[PDB]
Design a protein around this motif. Sequence first.
Motif, PDB file in Angstrom:
ATOM      1  N   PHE A 209       0.830  -1.199   0.000  1.00 13.02           N
ATOM      2  CA  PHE A 209       0.000   0.000   0.000  1.00 13.02           C
ATOM      3  C   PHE A 209       0.867   1.251   0.000  1.00 13.02           C
ATOM      4  O   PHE A 209       0.714   2.129  -0.858  1.00 13.02           O
ATOM      5  N   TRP A 210       1.807   1.337   0.946  1.00 10.12           N
ATOM      6  CA  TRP A 210       2.625   2.539   1.064  1.00 10.12           C
ATOM      7  C   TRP A 210       3.503   2.750  -0.165  1.00 10.12           C
ATOM      8  O   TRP A 210       3.711   3.892  -0.587  1.00 10.12           O
ATOM      9  N   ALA A 211       4.003   1.657  -0.764  1.00  7.85           N
ATOM     10  CA  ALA A 211       4.779   1.768  -1.996  1.00  7.85           C
ATOM     11  C   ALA A 211       3.947   2.404  -3.096  1.00  7.85           C
ATOM     12  O   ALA A 211       4.433   3.257  -3.850  1.00  7.85           O
ATOM     13  N   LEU A 212       2.680   2.001  -3.189  1.00  4.44           N
ATOM     14  CA  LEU A 212       1.790   2.535  -4.200  1.00  4.44           C
ATOM     15  C   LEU A 212       1.430   3.975  -3.876  1.00  4.44           C
ATOM     16  O   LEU A 212       1.548   4.853  -4.733  1.00  4.44           O
ATOM     17  N   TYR A 213       1.034   4.239  -2.621  1.00  4.76           N
ATOM     18  CA  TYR A 213       0.612   5.582  -2.232  1.00  4.76           C
ATOM     19  C   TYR A 213       1.731   6.605  -2.433  1.00  4.76           C
ATOM     20  O   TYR A 213       1.477   7.729  -2.899  1.00  4.76           O
TER      21      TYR A 213
END
Length: 182
Positions: free
Chosen positions: A43-47
């Motif tokens: 998630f954080w990689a994408l965000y």
Amino acid sequence: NPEHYIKHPLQNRWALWFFKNDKSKTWQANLRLISKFDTVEDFWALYNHIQLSSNLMPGCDYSLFKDGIEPMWEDEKNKRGGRWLITLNKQQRRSDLDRFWLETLLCLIGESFDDYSDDVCGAVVNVRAKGDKIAIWTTECENRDAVTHIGRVYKERLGLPPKIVIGYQSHADTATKNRFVV
């Protein structure tokens, strides 16, 4: 020792969608699946890779939906449901939009609505010149207990003041009025 090398799984797999108003294409064909993820780290990689909603030109949308639910009313899990709507004035694009959207994403992936998180389908942010909007979509607008619990928790999560009311509208009604306020 699993803690060190294992990614932290999410309860659901989620898909992030993007929409931009290209008048040369059908509405359906302008809708665009960015990526799916199912761990905290992914998630954080994408965000961290994508634009803040406040940096999108008017007419664009992000949405985050449970894998297998398309972000449109026509989907089997959306057509009898509805949404908790957050409306933002033109001055809140700067102050609240991005932090409200991030908080909304985390309410989703962190399953912050207890038993009723199963009723959540996804969330949508609309960047518009007349005013931005954020909404959590749930699957059954008649589920009084689920819908009102989602609305109460959501409102507290955004830190909205108790003099403000947010409203819940069925999609079927939106397509042509509040069913709940919290």
